[PDB]
Amino acid sequence: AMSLENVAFNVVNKGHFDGQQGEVPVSIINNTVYTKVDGVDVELFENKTTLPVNVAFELWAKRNIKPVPEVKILNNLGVDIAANTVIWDYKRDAPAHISTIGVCSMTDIAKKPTETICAPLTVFFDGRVDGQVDLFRNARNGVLITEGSVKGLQPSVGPKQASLNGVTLIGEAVKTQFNYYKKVDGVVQQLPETYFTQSRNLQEFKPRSQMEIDFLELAMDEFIERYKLEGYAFEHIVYGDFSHSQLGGLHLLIGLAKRFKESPFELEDFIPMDSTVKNYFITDAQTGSSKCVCSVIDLLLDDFVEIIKSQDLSVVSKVVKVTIDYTEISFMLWCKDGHVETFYPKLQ
Amino acid sequence: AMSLENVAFNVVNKGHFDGQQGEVPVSIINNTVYTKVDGVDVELFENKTTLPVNVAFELWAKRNIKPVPEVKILNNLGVDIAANTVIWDYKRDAPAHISTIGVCSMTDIAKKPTETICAPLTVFFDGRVDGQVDLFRNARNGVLITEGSVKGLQPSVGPKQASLNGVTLIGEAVKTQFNYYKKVDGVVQQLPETYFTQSRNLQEFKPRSQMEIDFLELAMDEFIERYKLEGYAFEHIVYGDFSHSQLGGLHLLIGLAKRFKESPFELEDFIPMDSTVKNYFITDAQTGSSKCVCSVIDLLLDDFVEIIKSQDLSVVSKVVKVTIDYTEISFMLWCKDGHVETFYPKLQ
Amino acid sequence: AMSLENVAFNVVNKGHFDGQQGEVPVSIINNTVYTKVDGVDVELFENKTTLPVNVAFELWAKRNIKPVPEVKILNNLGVDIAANTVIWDYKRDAPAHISTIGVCSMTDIAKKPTETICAPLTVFFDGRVDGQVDLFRNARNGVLITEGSVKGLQPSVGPKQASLNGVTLIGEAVKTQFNYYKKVDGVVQQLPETYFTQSRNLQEFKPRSQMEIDFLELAMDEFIERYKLEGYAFEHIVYGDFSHSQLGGLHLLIGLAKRFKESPFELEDFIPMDSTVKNYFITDAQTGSSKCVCSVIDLLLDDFVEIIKSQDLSVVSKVVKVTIDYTEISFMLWCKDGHVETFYPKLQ
Amino acid sequence: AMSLENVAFNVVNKGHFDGQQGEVPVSIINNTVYTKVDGVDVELFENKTTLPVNVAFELWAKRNIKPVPEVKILNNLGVDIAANTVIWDYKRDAPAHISTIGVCSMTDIAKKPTETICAPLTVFFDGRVDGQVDLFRNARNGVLITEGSVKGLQPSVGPKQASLNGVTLIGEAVKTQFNYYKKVDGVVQQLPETYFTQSRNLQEFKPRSQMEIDFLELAMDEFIERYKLEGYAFEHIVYGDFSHSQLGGLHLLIGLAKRFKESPFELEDFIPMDSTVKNYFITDAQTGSSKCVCSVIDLLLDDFVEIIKSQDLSVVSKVVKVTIDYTEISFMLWCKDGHVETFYPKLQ
Amino acid sequence: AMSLENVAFNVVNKGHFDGQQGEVPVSIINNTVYTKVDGVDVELFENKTTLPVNVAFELWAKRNIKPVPEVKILNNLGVDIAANTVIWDYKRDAPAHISTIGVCSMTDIAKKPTETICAPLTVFFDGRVDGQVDLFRNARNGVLITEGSVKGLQPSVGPKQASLNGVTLIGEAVKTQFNYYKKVDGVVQQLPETYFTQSRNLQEFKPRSQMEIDFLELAMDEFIERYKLEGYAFEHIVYGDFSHSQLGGLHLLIGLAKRFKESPFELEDFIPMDSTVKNYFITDAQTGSSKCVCSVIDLLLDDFVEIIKSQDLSVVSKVVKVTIDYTEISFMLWCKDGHVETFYPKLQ
Numbered sequence A, B, C, D, E: 001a002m003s004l005e006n007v008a009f010n011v012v013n014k015g016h017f018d019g020q021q022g023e024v025p026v027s028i029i030n031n032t033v034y035t036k037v038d039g040v041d042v043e044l045f046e047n048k049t050t051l052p053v054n055v056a057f058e059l060w061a062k063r064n065i066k067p068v069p070e071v072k073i074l075n076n077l078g079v080d081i082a083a084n085t086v087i088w089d090y091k092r093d094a095p096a097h098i099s100t101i102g103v104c105s106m107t108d109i110a111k112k113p114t115e116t117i118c119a120p121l122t123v124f125f126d127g128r129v130d131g132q133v134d135l136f137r138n139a140r141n142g143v144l145i146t147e148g149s150v151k152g153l154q155p156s157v158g159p160k161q162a163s164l165n166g167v168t169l170i171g172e173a174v175k176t177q178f179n180y181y182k183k184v185d186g187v188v189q190q191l192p193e194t195y196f197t198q199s200r201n202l203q204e205f206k207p208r209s210q211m212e213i214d215f216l217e218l219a220m221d222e223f224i225e226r227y228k229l230e231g232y233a234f235e236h237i238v239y240g241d242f243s244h245s246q247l248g249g250l251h252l253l254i255g256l257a258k259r260f261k262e263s264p265f266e267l268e269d270f271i272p273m274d275s276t277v278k279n280y281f282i283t284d285a286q287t288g289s290s291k292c293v294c295s296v297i298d299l300l301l302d303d304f305v306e307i308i309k310s311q312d313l314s315v316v317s318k319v320v321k322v323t324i325d326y327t328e329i330s331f332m333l334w335c336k337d338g339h340v341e342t343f344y345p346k347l348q
């Protein structure tokens, strides 16, 4: 017996929707849900979505609170909808998918993913929930995540990290590295070889390799010497050039992190969403060097070094396609006299 | 188990809240409540109140659908709150009272009128509901309506008309004339002898006496002759003077109705609420005669004639207090040489 | 090159979207679209929909301005979406369907109805537009309307009336009676034999037969005598019983229209949408007789007389199913000693 | 000492702003202003403007309540702002001008029209207010209205009618016909000779000449015979042609009024504002004949007959410019073999 | 061809408006602009302005992204409007000026600053844009900024810092120190001798002189001794007195910065805007010492020492006017027995 007052009761008493019985008094004013606590209104939820306030409230309350794949991965894999859960997009403060299956009466297109409406949609299945590996097996389109092996099916080892309540982390007390499976029109797909983005923050950046430790601790010309990166434009691409009005390069999160410790800078996230490649309007506070669209990718420095060293440097300009987070990311490679001039995630 | 979805189920299936079990999907957007009917949103309620949308929706759904006293009467009797019902104010599109008793968890100050919080409030009791005459006897303050006698209680015969779902009518298939009782500080108060306003509309005005039929059919000078009203300023007070820029008199609804048939006019209801005396910014469309505050009362013409003929016409100006709808309405009487010049519901 | 300013230019200069080039300055504030006309804002549209303001504005501007089937018919036929047009629902002030095909970038699920997303949806096709009869033949699900014969397709003759810009009318300068066709799962479905509702208003009701003229002019007992309706409970069903607190019968629009001329009454349309059977919370102003859910159908009196006279009157209570507006409407027939007691569109 | 609570006090006690001292409690919620009346909120104003709610409330309260020129006239004369008053536009429910002079602290550009900011603006002056004729003489740009002669200034006799609180009327108890004066760049401009629109409604249309009485009473062919209008296309232009899907002609309000009595029709006012020529999306309910943009002008039939009979009928198509309400209205005249085919207010 | 969808396309693809062709689907809900990115809504802009949402969105997209003068400077110089650009006020999240010239159709008063409407307004001209030094030369009122010299015109050297996308900085890769020119009624003004505020933050405070380094590193009595500031009330004015309930002095940002490293404190910015002098409701967390209006100015400590040492200390209380950021800032100087008691930016 689903209700606004019951969803609110669960939020107040259980921290989220937990199927518990009970009702608390609720008031809705504009885009905010309130509850009366000893005669005064306490805010429970502020609707930042394009859905009706009470509908967004129920989907947020019914969000998956287990470590789940990051929305960028699900998007890159073509996920349209989730099976009997809500993947909450914490970067957008909104549900990751428009419709639901067996979650909310206003957004449900079906109660079970076996309904014919779900057949053409890529449904997300969670092998950690009972019977979901079998629902994937019976589904025409879908993406499956598991913690262990699946009989017959060959896995694609996903990223080490997952999102737990909006916190991207590599689990120690929980499993965050999943096996990924995908089916298009009833056929189990062979997922491609892929690099993964590291999903780190600019403020809390931690190196994940000896090369990353050396980049953060060494001086620019010491690191380029140690790692034989002469002629690969790391000075421009990774370190950044703040000498002209237009900020040069600075496309790797580790380079932004190194800079951030010394001089702060403004990053305007003009398209706020989870994506493999992020675009920022950057303004360097120390120099006044700036760039309207500065594409940034967080690759492990070793993976970026491997990608750039595996390219033909004899062309003036070409598109270099790299598989990252299961999607095809186009890069722009510009060379001159056999040396790199620039390499950046292609702005389109 | 009260919920928004259950209140909505009742509205859709029963025309109002009827305590039936069930839920329909609801969406709230801004100040409107919608329900999904075959994949599309259908508006159920638009909040015109100062309460939260979902709260106003539940109080409107829980409105008393039996003939009830008109809000002006309840206001004139000092009613603060109703016992276990909602008097919906259709003139304001809002609950007639701020708080409720045993109706809605958001607006309830008490579940029963016997709670000590209700003691200082004048609670409205409906003798047609079981145990409500007893609750009135136990109440410190209150107004009671009944269809018959209550042993020991001296009754006040109320108006012939009552409001049934916003329609003011004199019942033929239902009883609309009630006995009224009031209590202030544990003590039954004797309600005063009173005139009652007729609660008629300008558009559908119907005479309720031979004098009212004669006013609408006869010419000004022959009605004044027939009813011996010479020297009582009916030409100014009732008929209206449209010869000057400021509209003269026109304080009785029957006079406005007679005028309306011949020439239309705009009545700006700048304080839209139910009241014994109504104030309008009137603009006569034929002449351009206008008045910012034109007080209008709908008294039966015979009752108005009786009031004006029961006054001493030897003073230049005095306040004449008349009990109408249980409240004391002050009129302003202006005389000259023993004749009336003007008589109007005195602007406070 | 679709834009808000171009949609607004078309509204201002052509009365609706007409594909004309040009832009006018627009301002959006809350749920209203304004345009600057000589330095002042003029309201162009007020959003009464659950869609974003600018989106609802474009769909309203792109509404079909040719006589189209009434939304009740489309709903009864299972229409989910329209092919390259917008059926505007004037009873709801909103699009009749959630999504569009080739209309607006925000609501489009496809540019053409041939896209695989449209296959499971019942798409509405208009044979008056080029290539739409063919698109219906290629559609898995759909409803087709035509002004003439389609080789091979067995037609269903629809109602005489259609909606032209919110005005329901029987065309004289335009064709409003269409041939209807339906397809479910690639298979043409034979539309059932049906009665049609007349789509008349209470305020401007006009009889459409000698029996309807006789009902409105003759007294209750002489009409029942002339048409041999003795023992069919027309006194209760059609005329209405206003003697008790609960209003008895009154389920045919013609009966409400006859009553309306003599005594006015309030009809609360608590589910405001177009439907074959309408539900109203009725309050009779003369008597105070009322009913929370009074189902009303507008059938031609001859069609209602035919339905009631074609029933077996030997059962106490049974469901009588009648096909009206292509949908199966269940009625409740209550008899006693071979005579009708009541017959009403059964409340679901 | 201007305040929201004082503006509200004036509205409640005087029907509008009257400079009286006092305060009432006010609450603002969304776009509505409320006041507490005996413990409950009563709506005083609903903001339909693009200004902040409290600002629109004060300008509406401070509206000119004397008969003023109709907004179409002021617009046609180039009025940008009013001197120390607010012309309320009742067709738009908004102030007729963006800014004020000596009215409201939020919208004031100046306290007096003598301030240099007002010099390039055409300020409206009211000769009925003390010192305003002098302020016009000192103004660089302006429009002046007077009830009599101004020594030296050559007057323009305006329309008989004016707007008194939204009611357009020809005054009997007040003066509504004004003398008009205009100044552009310090120089008095001679206002042109002009026809005036009659400002009548479709619902309450009243003839203002023997020709207008004859048009409404006589049949089409006998009116055209009596007034020698053969070959002037009155059948198309004035009467309207409802035989084809596109409604033919119907550009004079009297023709729409004659039609309205027999058959009703929908007029969609897609640009709701006061203008000399009005544009409507018309749908005829009887025939289904319709037109997206049907320009309508309310000229006295004699004035229209004079205009059409004063044209050379030897050209196929030409623009005929006529001065109406001080503005130049371009008409489109289409002839064939010396007879009129169509004549309509040319769609810009 | 300006549109909402084109402005949105530019924001998404270029980080701001760049005149690029293209359209993205947009939805407006309340005060937020969204765009569809792979079937989900992504927020592009939240309107914090008093302008319509779509209008504020276009002005924000069309903001000047080059280092521009800080809004306080432009305000102090009397700038009313900018020539063909938008100075975005990042302290208010709104345009710095009401109207625009050649930017947006809704806010434009003119397309070119040469139009007569601009003559009485102080237009801001940017010498870095072609032909703007000549538009200033031809303009009646204006402020001009240049990077280099202007023939004939003597410059006023502005502050070292400018705002680049909301980041106030002293440029190293871009020029931020401009030459200022001003014209009032066609006459090139001689701008006054002025001090400049340093525009530093409380958190990221960096000293800009040996005296400022000494203030932050030395103990109160060591610094006052070294700089011979005995008898100048630096203990009260600069350091702050936190011993009583009312916080004493603390009017210089460097003093707040020194305090902030040791003990944190709440600064309530009750008038959030850019101004030479800032007012804060300060509460010291360590002591509970507080002040409702604590005026703070960020002057270079050497400039403040120079101002205070250039005053006559023989009066009890006088207003000391100092030119800071081209405006006249009144200070209050209180002395006793030839020594300073307090000196603060005068609260009016």
Ligand SMILES: CC(C)(CO)NC(=O)c1cccc(Cl)c1
Residues within 6 Å of the ligand: A202, A264, A265, A266, A267, A268, A269, A285, E167
């Ligand atoms: C405080 C400043 C303006 C210093 O330049 N900005 C930041 O510290 C910062 C860091 C990362 C992202 C974003 Cl948006 C701002």
Ligand SMILES: CC(C)(CO)NC(=O)c1cccc(Cl)c1
Residues within 6 Å of the ligand: B202, B264, B265, B266, B267, B268, B285, D166, D167
């Ligand atoms: C349009 C005019 C001004 C014509 O006189 N007014 C009305 O029709 C009218 C009648 C009764 C009440 C209200 Cl408010 C307006």
Ligand SMILES: CC(C)(CO)NC(=O)c1cccc(Cl)c1
Residues within 6 Å of the ligand: B166, B167, C202, C264, C265, C266, C267, C268, C285
């Ligand atoms: C004001 C009253 C209650 C008078 O009977 N009702 C109406 O005039 C009326 C008529 C038809 C429909 C609706 Cl909703 C109301």
Ligand SMILES: CC(C)(CO)NC(=O)c1cccc(Cl)c1
Residues within 6 Å of the ligand: C166, C167, D202, D264, D265, D266, D267, D268, D285
């Ligand atoms: C309901 C219909 C379509 C019936 O013809 N229209 C009107 O009653 C009507 C009359 C005048 C103006 C407007 Cl907008 C509508």
Ligand SMILES: CC(C)(CO)NC(=O)c1cccc(Cl)c1
Residues within 6 Å of the ligand: E202, E264, E265, E266, E267, E268, E269, E285
């Ligand atoms: C966290 C506290 C409450 C500690 O006192 N405040 C701050 O750190 C702080 C600093 C500067 C300005 C503002 Cl508003 C707050």
